[PDB]
Amino acid sequence: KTTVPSYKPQNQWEGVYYYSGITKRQRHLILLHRKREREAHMRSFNISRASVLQRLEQLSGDRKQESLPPHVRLDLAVRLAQHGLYQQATPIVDELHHQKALHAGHYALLINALACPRLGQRILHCDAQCDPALTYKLLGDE
């Protein structure tokens, strides 16, 4: 039962040979470029977050006894919640509410900024692989 290891009609059900697909090097270069873009987006988000936290600290150091107008505090709290620093913004919204400077539009503005749009953008471009469906899933853990 031993075998034998071998190897004008034309097969009409065999398709023509054509060049489909990429090279190993091209795939590696695609990976490299996507990784560089991911680094660029992470660097942008980190720089912006650091700048906003620096602004928060400078403003707090200035406001040890002086109270700033409500609008600058509203903007800073909105930016903090936008960058995901919600716990840093609870005091600002609490004092604005106690002072009764917030209104219908401002409350909705703060609750919307609380969804972390900038952090969501960073997650989308970096960790969610630009998947809008997975961005929501990845934002929920934070």
Partner 1 sequence: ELYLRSIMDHANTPTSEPLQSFANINVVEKKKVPLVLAQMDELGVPRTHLSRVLMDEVEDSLRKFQTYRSRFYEWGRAVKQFDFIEFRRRNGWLYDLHLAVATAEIPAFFNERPAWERPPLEETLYGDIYYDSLHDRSPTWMNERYDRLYGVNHPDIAKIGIRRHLNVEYVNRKEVVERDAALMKKTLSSGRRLRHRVESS
Partner 2 sequence: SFRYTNNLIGALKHRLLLESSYREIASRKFIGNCRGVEVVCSGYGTVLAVQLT
Partner 3 sequence: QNKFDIMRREDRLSKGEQDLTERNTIHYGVPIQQIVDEFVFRHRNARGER
Binding site for partner 2 (CB under 8 A): 60, 90-91, 94, 98
Selected binder of partner 1 within 28, 32, 35, 37 (CB under 8 A): 37
Whichever of 92 and 119 has its CB closer to partner 3, that residue is 119
Those residues with Cβ within 8 angstroms of residue 71's Cβ, 6 or more apart along the chain or in another chain: none
Measured distance CA(125)–CA(131) in Å, rounded: 8
Report in angstroms how near the CB of residue 130 gets to partner 3 at its nearest.
Answer: 16
DSSP sequence for 18-33: ---S--HHHHHHHHHH
Q: Is 130 in the site for partner 1 (CB under 8 A)?
A: yes
Q: Is 9 in the site for partner 3 (CB under 8 A)?
A: no
Whichever of 105 and 140 has its CB closer to partner 3, that residue is 140
Measured distance CA(45)–CA(83) in Å, rounded: 8
